[PDB]
């Protein structure tokens, strides 16, 4: 019918790094996953480049409100977290670079 796995266990920096700029991904991935020190917070990644040293991976911090839901930009916020993700797909709206496609999960 349909899946969603944008979204990752309390996966490191340098894990997400390394299955973004893994032989599989490429610009336009993104990813998301949860905090591992400071649990209750979230960290967004997405793939970037850049014409001056080339393949990248951007990182967001994604904080929480008191009585909200979760937000990147104090602008506009969201109670959930799939809603960010449609808006991201939609448009960067914030971002440096719109989302394309969520990291790559087949077997």
């Given amino acids: 019918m349909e899946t969603e796995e944008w979204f990752f266990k309390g996966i490191s920096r340098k ?3 390394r299955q973004l ?5 490429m ?3 993104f990813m998301i996953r949860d905090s591992e020190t400071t649990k209750g917070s979230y960290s967004l990644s997405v793939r970037d480049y850049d014409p001056r040293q080339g393949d990248t991976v951007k990182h967001y911090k ?3 409100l008191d009585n909200g839901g979760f937000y990147i930009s104090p602008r506009s916020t969201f109670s959930t977290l799939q809603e960010l993700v449609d808006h991201y ?4 709206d914030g971002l440096c670079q719109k989302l394309s496609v969520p990291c790559m999960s087949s077997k």
Wanted: charged share 30%.
């Fill in 27 to 29: 610009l336009g991935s």
């Fill in 89 to 92: 797909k939609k448009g960067n």
């Fill in 21 to 25: 700029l893994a032989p599989g991904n």
């Fill in 62 to 64: 994604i904080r929480t």
């Fill in 15 to 17: 894990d997400a790094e």
